[PDB]
Amino acid sequence: MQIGFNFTLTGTLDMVQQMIKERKIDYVEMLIDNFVHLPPEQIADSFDCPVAFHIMLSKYLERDREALAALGKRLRRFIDVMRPVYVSDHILYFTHNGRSLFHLGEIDYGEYDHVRSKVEQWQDMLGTRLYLENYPSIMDGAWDAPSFYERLSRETGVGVLFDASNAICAQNNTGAPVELWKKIIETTRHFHVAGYGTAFIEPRVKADTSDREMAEDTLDFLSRMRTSFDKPGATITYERDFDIDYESISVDLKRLRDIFPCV
Amino acid sequence: SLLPTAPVRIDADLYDDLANPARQSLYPRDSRGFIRIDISLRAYWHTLFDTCPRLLELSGPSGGAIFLPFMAWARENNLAFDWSFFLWVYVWLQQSEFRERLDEDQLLPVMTASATRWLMIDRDIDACQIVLGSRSLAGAAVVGAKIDSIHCRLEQVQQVAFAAPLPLPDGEFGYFLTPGFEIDHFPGWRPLPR
Ligand SMILES: [Fe+3]
Numbered sequence: 001m002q003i004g005f006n007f008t009l010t011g012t013l014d015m016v017q018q019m020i021k022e023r024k025i026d027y028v029e030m031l032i033d034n035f036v037h038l039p040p041e042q043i044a045d046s047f048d049c050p051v052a053f054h055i056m057l058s059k060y061l062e063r064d065r066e067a068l069a070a071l072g073k074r075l076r077r078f079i080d081v082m083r084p085v086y087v088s089d090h091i092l093y094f095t096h097n098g099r100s101l102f103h104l105g106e107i108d109y110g111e112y113d114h115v116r117s118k119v120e121q122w123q124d125m126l127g128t129r130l131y132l133e134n135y136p137s138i139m140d141g142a143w144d145a146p147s148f149y150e151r152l153s154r155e156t157g158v159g160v161l162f163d164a165s166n167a168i169c170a171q172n173n174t175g176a177p178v179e180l181w182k183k184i185i186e187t188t189r190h191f192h193v194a195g196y197g198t199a200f201i202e203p204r205v206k207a208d209t210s211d212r213e214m215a216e217d218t219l220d221f222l223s224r225m226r227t228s229f230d231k232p233g234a235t236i237t238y239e240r241d242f243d244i245d246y247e248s249i250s251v252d253l254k255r256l257r258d259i260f261p262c263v
Numbered sequence: 264s265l266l267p268t269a270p271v272r273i274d275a276d277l278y279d280d281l282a283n284p285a286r287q288s289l290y291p292r293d294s295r296g297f298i299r300i301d302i303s304l305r306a307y308w309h310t311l312f313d314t315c316p317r318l319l320e321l322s323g324p325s326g327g328a329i330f331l332p333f334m335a336w337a338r339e340n341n342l343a344f345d346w347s348f349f350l351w352v353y354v355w356l357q358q359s360e361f362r363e364r365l366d367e368d369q370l371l372p373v374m375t376a377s378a379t380r381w382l383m384i385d386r387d388i389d390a391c392q393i394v395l396g397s398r399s400l401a402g403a404a405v406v407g408a409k410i411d412s413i414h415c416r417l418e419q420v421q422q423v424a425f426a427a428p429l430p431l432p433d434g435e436f437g438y439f440l441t442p443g444f445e446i447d448h449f450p451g452w453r454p455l456p457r
């Protein structure tokens with residue numbers, strides 16, 4: 001298990017480079033579509049470690065093809081220069097009838113035929129194996145998603161970026177046990193982990209706010225099934241998007257390495 | 264122990280109501296579908312007011328006197344909640360009970376908010392800076408530039424003064440995009456999207 005950190009804001013650089021130098025993380029996952037106008041060689045020369053790619057806002061499920069192709073070709077040039085460990089993206093509903101959601105929607109997994117066609121086309125544009133992340137479900141599509149990603153992954157060669165946190169959100173909001181994902185966990189080698197929050201008006205509903213330490217059950221999940229997570233090429237990226245505190249992050253990182261010792 | 268999904272099952276059933284605080288009531292208080300809409304309305308709330316806290320001096324701390332009326336006015340006028348979001352709030356504000364209390368100190372934070380949103384979410388490869396103009400900001404503009412170096416020690420949004428006279432836009436706001444990180448040319452203002 002290589003441990004990673006997600007680099008999203010330009011002003012976290014000095015701190016991220018210091019966790020690299022101090023061997024607290026082995027690679028850097030990059031929200032690459034935020035840096036598409038940066039010179040790609042510059043990113044590779046700011047990290048003395050491997051990088052991986054996470055794409056937030058392709059909107060490949062809805063974006064027009066001319067804009068989508070241009071993004072793909074720019075991402076292709078970045079893939080060539082940095083050789084990312086993997087390239088990943090999401091399954092997200094961004095836009096209802098022309099207007100933008102600010103809290104992104106879980107796609108309706110009954111729409112398999114539509115997702116499949118866009119995933120194939122997007123992954124073709126990217127020119128490489130794509131990994132798709134699971135939504136931190138609130139509504140009951142949580143019970144549908146494990147069987148849906150499995151299907152999508154064998155008809156299209158696509159990988160699953162299994163985010164343990166989001167699956168535990170899914171469990172707490174819908175009952176849908178994380179065990180539903182065992183076959184995917186034992187297949188993919190790339191994982192996400194973060195802390196989750198709560199709604200302002202319902203502490204029982206869990207939000208993917210990425211702002212705090214991981215829960216005691218997101219750590220039980222990685223502990224209980226560390227054998228199924230860990231495998232030869234395996235990685236887990238720790239996400240912290242808000243309250244980016246060097247010491248609060250650093251203990252969650254060691255907390256990860258306690259679960260996955262180096263040998 | 265779980266909150267019932269009650270009238271619905273999956274997020275797709277809730278799409279139409281995720282930005283409509285009027286229709287939130289029609290879901291049972293104890294229902295999960297009520298909760299999910301609330302999470303999504305809070306997201307619109309916080310995007311508006313965390314980024315532009317001085318607007319709470321107008322609405323009061325709950326932001327209600329702006330938010331509810333602006334939300335319902337947004338569905339009516341079918342805005343896309345695009346990067347022009349903030350500017351579209353200020354436009355609504357210009358015709359609300361608050362129209363007399365707008366000044367530069369309210370105007371500039373919403374222009375910086377829309378400029379930052381554009382340079383964060385926009386995925387057009389041949390669009391490098393956005394240039395925002397308003398009729399309440401003569402001779403100057405708010406320019407939002409995408410990141411083009413990991414080492415820029417400056418902010419990506421700047422107020423810039425022009426030397427040649429700059430036309431007032433037709434509406435309260437107008438904008439244009441530049442293909443690189445220079446402004447060599449003024450193509451004339453375009454109206455706010457949506
Ligand atoms: Fe993600």
Ligand SMILES: [Fe+3]
Nearest residue numbers: 163192193239
């Ligand atoms: Fe994640």
